[PDB]
Amino acid sequence: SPVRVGLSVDASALGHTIPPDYTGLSYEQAQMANPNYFSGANTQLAGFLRTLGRQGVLRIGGNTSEYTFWNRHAKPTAADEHLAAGPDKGHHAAAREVITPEAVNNLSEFLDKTGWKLIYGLNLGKGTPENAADEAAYVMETIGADRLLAFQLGNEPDLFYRNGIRPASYDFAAYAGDWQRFFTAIRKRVPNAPFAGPDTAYNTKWLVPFADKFKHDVKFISSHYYAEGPPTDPSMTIERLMKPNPRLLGETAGLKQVEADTGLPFRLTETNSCYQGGKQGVSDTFAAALWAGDLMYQQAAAGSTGINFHGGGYGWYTPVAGTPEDGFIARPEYYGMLLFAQAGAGQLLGAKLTDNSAAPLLTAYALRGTDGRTRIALFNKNLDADVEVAISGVASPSGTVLRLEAPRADDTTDVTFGGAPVGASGSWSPLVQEYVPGHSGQFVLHMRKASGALLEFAKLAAALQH
């Protein structure tokens, strides 16, 4: 028998607005060594991004951003034509890579084909301020002010003290000194250069001090989140992934604090399920779709203005896997992002769950879409409990449900949304879409254990609309 829970939607309780560019992906800067990857000719990957959102943000950074060196005078053949750069595993220094001018030109084409904007890492870890200024100049010229959202000066500088990038004495004050030096050099050469930071791994104590010190220098504040790690740890499981943890609560409190105290927006610029490259049997499973879709909404409800899921290559947690030579595919996590994409932009509404102590990992989010239709995204992250959700406060003659499903929570394949897999180049259309009748604003939705659902409700009295 299902656990019977109540979901009370309150259209009068307006929450945060979900902007059109909320969604996003993050990749290693090392990928810029291969001009064929972010390229106008990479129609497959561009298609996968367009399906994730008409608007969205591509963030380039990560550990390899300290090991990539822009060279305006590179031979064009300094490029690695085959490289599909997977997430850096953070055990040792990454291989040094050159970024060539054509890689930046090709990145511009890719942004034009996808319609996405760019967050671009600069090498504060090991590069010179002069070269950062030159790199920034080329990127601004080539990408353009319209599509360049922000430069970030270093990746996860809160870990420099332990990963060899800086001495063990490095702290916020030292980083602030580094940041000012690079900022000044860049702005001299590029007076309209936009910035975000601190792009920290975890240390929320850096957020408000960064925002306070550099308030007039930045567009938004950024930090990272990984739910689990290290991947070799047997405590890091699918069941754990379905639950909140102190790191998440700290990041959530951190983003709320920086927004309240400074008025600057926050973006989660690098996130995924398990750090140091992800975990086989967790990150590459259907559970990751539930995790990712839920995280997108939870962060938005808290005030986050966007997200960037890290990935690349065939990494265990990558949303899209593949190469320009062999083709690209949607991994299970992609389907959670797809649910969000299909729901679309709009404004969150109050949605409170009750009678849910026996199904505590069920989450639900209500949205008034830009088109005026109510949507509800539900994630039944309870691995062992089916639920029956009594939904109130939605006035609509009827709703349709698209299901996010796999036959087992640990499946690495067999994932469908709306009864269909995603195909080549991000192709997707729903093939199974069940009708839910309502009365007096009330609906009853069953969900099997370890599943998700997107409900879309019809307008009132609109059967004859054009």
TrEMBL record:
Pfam short name (any one): Glyco_hydro_79C
Top-level lineage group: Bacteria
Positions of beta-D-glucuronate binding: E28, N63, D88, N155, E156, E270, Q276, G277, Y317
GO cellular component: membrane
Molecular function per GO: hydrolase activity, acting on glycosyl bonds
InterPro entries for this protein: GH, GH79_Enzymes, GlcAase_C, Glyco_hydro_79, Glyco_hydro_b
Ranges where the Beta-glucuronidase C-terminal domain occurs: 364-454
Transmembrane parts of this sequence: none
PANTHER family cross-referenced by the UniProt entry: BETA-GLUCURONIDASE, BETA-GLUCURONIDASE C-TERMINAL DOMAIN-CONTAINING PROTEIN
Protein name stated in the entry: Beta-glucuronidase C-terminal domain-containing protein
Organism from which the protein derives: Acidobacterium capsulatum (strain ATCC 51196 / DSM 11244 / BCRC 80197 / JCM 7670 / NBRC 15755 / NCIMB 13165 / 161)
Lineage of origin: Bacteria, Pseudomonadati, Acidobacteriota, Terriglobia, Terriglobales
